[model samples]
Each structure stands twice: as C-alpha cells, then as structure tokens.
Target: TLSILVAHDLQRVIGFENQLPWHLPNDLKNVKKLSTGHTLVMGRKTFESIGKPLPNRRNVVLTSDTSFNVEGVDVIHSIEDIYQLPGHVFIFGGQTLFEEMIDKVDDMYITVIEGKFRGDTFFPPYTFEDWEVASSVEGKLDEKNTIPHTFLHLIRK
Candidate 1:
C-alpha cells in the first residue's frame, strides 16, 4: 500500500528555501505516527532537507545518480521497485516526487496550514475528484503553536 503525507499553505505552497515555512511539532509527529510500521520514500532533495534517516522506519531515497548513496538509507533510481518491497510505503516528498507519485497513491494525509506563506516550492495543484474525504478536523488553537491547522484524511474512491 502507498499513501501520501503532506502539509501545505492555503496557496498550495509547501516549502520555502528548502524547509517548511512554519514549525508545528505536532504536525511533524502526525506524519511520523502515520508512517510508522511502514517505509518512507522521498526524493533526494527531501532526504537532504531532512538531514538524516528517520528512526524505526525504512528510509528510501529516490535518486537517478547511480553513485549517490547514503548510510542508513536505501537509495533507488525510481519508485517502480518500491512495490516489490516488504511492506507498506508512504511517499513523503519535496514537490517533485509528490508530483510523480500523486496519481498512484491509495490514500493521503494532508495538513492544511491556515495562512499564506512566501514559498518558492509549491505543492502540485490537484482536486480530490477521484477521492472522498474520509475525515476532517477544523483548526484548533493550542499553546504549542499559534497558527491554526486542519487535518484531512482522503481515501481513494
């Protein structure tokens, strides 16, 4: 099984200067929670942005450069062979990889940050016509972060 986990501003922007525009520890944890017991596949840029391999989950970085390799993470040239892996996989991307895997995923966990941000990188545009909203939560204010956020679970139709 393959799923996607992403967060984007209202304008569909997901990153700025190679990092998330905002900080939300809870949102980070939400991605981790959903990715546990499975694998995380990302583009090389995404892996570099993350800086290290995530613990307890199999890390797979997609790169076309054959000689490029990193300790503690498996590197592959394409997402095709990912299905041959042992278990579930989640695609956590840096725009480009998301665009490649978007149509192939089974479900999606999307976090909507309730604001605009000046971002150079953007989440690819798409509508959920082929999906059904399985769940949704309105933004809630908390002490950890002032920015309101909403979560959506979209299941494949």
Candidate 2:
C-alpha cells in the first residue's frame, strides 16, 4: 500500500524555507511511529532538506535529476518506479511530490496543527471526502509540543 505521512498548519502550509514552521515534538514522534520499517518515498528537494537518510527505514528519493545520489538511499528517476516498491510505502514530502502521488495514495497519516503559520509551501487541496477516517487521536500538550494537533489516519473509500 502507498500512504502519505505529512503535517500541515491550519492554513494548509507545510513548510517555510524548506523547514517546518512549527516545532512539535509529538508530531515528530508520530511520524516515526507510522513510518518506521516502511519504505519512505520523497522528492529530491525533500531529501535535500533532510540532509541525510533517516535511519531504520528504507529511503527512496524520486528525482528527475539523474545525477542526484545519496550513499544510503535509492534514487529513482520517475514516479512509476515507486509502484514497484515491495512493501508498504509512505510518501513523505515537499509539496510537489505530494501532488504527484495524491491519486496513487491508498492511505494518509495527517497531523493537523491547530494554528496557522506564514509559509510558502502548501499541501494541495485534497478531497478528504473521498476517504474515511480510520483513526483519530488528539495530541497531548506539553512544554515541547505546545500546539494543539490531531493525528488522523485515513483510508481511501
């Protein structure tokens, strides 16, 4: 199954200058909980922002730049290449990659932050009405994760 794991603010903004606009430790933990041991597919720009392959997961970078290569990650030239991935795959993104894989995604793990932030990158306007909620959880508020957020798991109906 192909799934997407992403976080966005109330305004649907995903990033600002290649980094998350808010710092929520709980959301970061949720990302690891959902994606560990699964294959992670991301675009080159996303990979660049991360700077290195995340440990404990199979990393695949989809890029049009044939010259792009990371020592511990698989580099693929096309979106079709991801269809051949063997196990559950998570599309972890920059906006463009998320848009490209939207139709092909079977599930989604979305963390919705309660507040809005100034950002340039945005998650595409997806029709959530086409999917059903599989699970939902409210994130706990703490000193490290002050923002209110919800963890929603969605399955394509």
Candidate 3:
C-alpha cells in the first residue's frame, strides 16, 4: 500500500515559497525508518527542496517537463507509474502531488504543529468520511526546539 508522510500546521500548509523548515527530528526519524528499502515518490520541486537524495531508498520524481535529472533518482511522469514498483511506497510532496495522491494513499503520517505560520503551500482537505485516525502522540521537541506538535497516524477507510 502507498503511504503519504508529511507534517503541517493548523492551516494545513506544509511549505512556504517551496521551502520547509527541517525541524521535526522525530518525524524525520520515523519517516526514515518507515521508508527504508522502499521507494519514495515526490514531485520535482519536493525533490529539489530536499537538496539531495535520501540514502538507502530509491527516489522517484514526477515531472511533466521530461528533462529533469538527479543522479540516482528515477524520473516518472505519472502517479500511476508508482504502482508498478515493488513493496511500500511513500508519497512525499509539494502541494499538487499530495492532492493528486490523496485518494490512492493508504495511510498518512502527519505531524500537526499547534500553531500556524505564513505559507504558500498546503495539504489537501482530508475527508473524515474516508479516513480514520489510527494513532497519535502530543509532544514537544526536545531541548533543541520551539514548537509543540502532535504526531498522528491516519488510515484510509
């Protein structure tokens, strides 16, 4: 099954002007553990935001232009192509891609921060009729941080 993993604020925004603050250590670690040995599918902008390919996983980038390149990353033109891969796949995002994969995603790992900030991108509206909260934890970042957040796991119904 495909899983979408992301962290967002109360406004459902995940990025600002195509960038995201890399402050969720716990969420990052969980993602790393969950995605190990699996493929990660994301849009070109999302790949650019990460700056480099993640170690130990195959990266698949979606793009319409057909000329994008990144060493060690496979480029795909459609979301349907993701299903051809073996094993679990994670759809990491930039707003548009997230919206496209919403219906196909089986689960979501969301880090919902308690506050909202100015942002230019956001996750799509989730329908409670189509999903159920599977688990959650309210926590504060360790001594090294500034925001309080809840890590929630939701499964599609």
In the range 13-92, model 1's lDDT, one tens digit per residue, is 89988899998877887887888778999998889999999998999999998998788899888778777777778889
TM-score of each: 0.94, 0.97, 0.92
lDDT to native, each model: 0.87, 0.91, 0.85
Model 2 compared with the native: what TM-score?
Answer: 0.97
User: What digit string (tens of lDDT, one per residue) describes model 3 on residues 1-49?
Assistant: 7889888898897998777743677667777888889889999898988
Residue-wise C-alpha lDDT for candidate 2, range 19-133, written one tens digit per residue: 8899999988888877788899998888999999998899999988878877999999988999999998999998999999878899999999999899999988877689899
Q: How accurate is candidate 3 locally (lDDT)?
A: 0.85
Off by over 4 Å in 3: none
Candidate 2: misplaced stretches above 4 Å?
A: none
**CA RMSD for every model?**
1.3, 0.9, 1.5
Error of 2 at 49 (Å): 0.6
Please estimate how well model 1 matches the true structure, expressed as its whole-model Cα lDDT: 0.87
